[PDB]
């Protein structure tokens, strides 16, 4: 039942407004171009003609525009009106622009939370999908109950630029996974003994296996932070040997992704450096 | 419910772990190893060690094999063709799909029920219900021995073709390495100097492990695309993948993260977009690696 304003009714901003309405919040919306708020008004939103009216309507102002340049074009004329309000900026952009906007919000007495949306418009308001936030802890703690309407909120910490970096790092993790998955699908689907398996059958097993892969990540993160990489029962020597088997199996079955060559070159450099007994986490030193 | 009689051939670190887990579950376990003197601890845990593989095979209706190579499997099993008739052989040696099939065919010629398997953990993970063992081959063997095999870990029946487990192992390891390398790349990006950086690997990984639920949703969404040969892009097209991969490439260069992953990703999506599939899903890329 809290008052919340959304600035920006593009596909994503309209979805945020819709999710706020579905949670029962008193939702005021504004967009630069008229005529994009009729469906939302039918669901109980109040559309207003100016950003100044929209900002004045709610103590919590959620911004979702195309660029950070657009954020300041809209909000800098309203600097005096933002004192004491909370600004949650879900616009995507660079870490430096997040930091510059946080500094600007601080200068004007607005509590500033920068965020990133880890889904597409249709995922907003649904379970499991993440929104990541960084900046004012008071803003996060005071707004979390309302922000929950959009998806699962995570507070990354106090530095407003964190969300931008996390988004890029998490997409890289997603692409590494999805590419290893595509490689596996193509291996399973290929003609050959034990092949001609569908992607759906493979993925049913893969989804179980990903539980084990997640434990590996949880085991290896403290190795990176300690700078100590004990290899235990799965050393880089064994990674490299088995990667060579993957390379050979892939070549036989006609799967050409670049992944095996990337993996063997990287592990090979760490082994040449004498770290063959270490965990996969030692490889962070060979990409950084 | 009722304890079984099982034989393990092979007392290397994995084979000895398998035998220990059968014992822990209450099974009457007979063990043999080519080299004597590796079954000491197992005997005190209740195993019966015998001197020859022939004695070991004759001791149990279920014969679990875990040797260094399929060459070794052949050297041990070939003189025992007659002795295997009517027994179930579960071969957890790692090896090639063709070697699994050839062993399967030999076992069938001699009247043994043959199940080939792969162990998706290391010796210390055996005997825990959270790690996977994948099996393929005789469904009669799997159904009849599943209760016993549960002692080792969670068993999964991949199907009737004995060679499948070998292929799944390699494919799942590739998936693991793609994930772990994307994770390493992300750890490096988060740890680097810069606004929003100097974040610990542990902090990053706390968020990453929540995010992996979403990544799994993508794999479950995209598998039917591959099987149908139809790749609707919907709200995440290859155009958008390519655009955001370029951001990743730029961010990584600025922070000195050099993993080769951004170049692999941009080149692959680039080929599909040049081919005219920019509006399709990530699943369309299967056609550009096979
Ligand atoms: N859609 C996604 O998949 C997704 C996922 C995660 C994050 N995001 C982020 O969410 C934000 C919104 O994306 P989107 O889907 O809504 O489409 P968008 O094209 O990125 O942004 C459209 C919105 O920005 C407004 N805008 C652009 N320039 C403006 C300016 N100079 N002054 C005032 N308003 C301006 C548009 O107003 P008009 O209607 O008047 O043109 C519209 O409301 C982006 O930063 C995007 O990167 C999107
Ligand atoms: N360890 C793991 O992390 C892991 C994970 C998944 C799968 N696996 C698979 O498990 C199997 C065994 O691995 P392991 O850890 O036990 O060590 P291993 O070195 O791969 O195999 C050692 C065992 O093989 C026996 N062996 C080797 N050559 C033989 C021959 N010509 N004739 C008879 N026996 C022979 C050795 O007997 P002796 O003692 O007399 O030399 C010993 O019992 C391998 O196929 C491995 O790939 C292992
Ligand atoms: Cl309120
Ligand atoms: Cl107010
Ligand atoms: Cl395929
Ligand atoms: Cl018997
Ligand atoms: Cl061999």
Numbering used by the authors:
A (entry chain A): 2 to 289
B (entry chain B): 0 to 289
Quote the study that presented this structure, word for word.
RedE, an IRED, serves as a biosynthetic enzyme in the formation of the indolocarbazole natural product reductasporine. RedE resembles the canonical IRED fold with an N-terminal NADPH-binding Rossmann domain and a C-terminal helical bundle mediating homodimerization. Here, we present crystal structures of RedE, including apo, NADP+-bound and two ternary complexes with AFA and NADP(H). These crystal structures reveal an unexpected secondary indolocarbazole binding site adjoined to the primary active site, and site-directed mutagenesis shows both are critical for catalysis.
E74 hydrogen bonds to the adenine C6-amine. The backbone N-H of A67 hydrogen bonds with the adenosine furan oxygen, while the S83 side chain and L66 backbone carbonyl and interact with the C2ʹ- and C3ʹ-hydroxyl of the nicotinamide riboside, respectively. The re-face of the nicotinamide C4 is positioned overtop the side chain of M13 with the si-face facing into a deep pocket formed at the dimer interface of the C-terminal helical bundle. Comparison of the apo and binary structures show that R33 moves out of the adenine binding area in order to stack against the purine ring while forming a salt bridge to the nearby 2ʹ-phosphate.
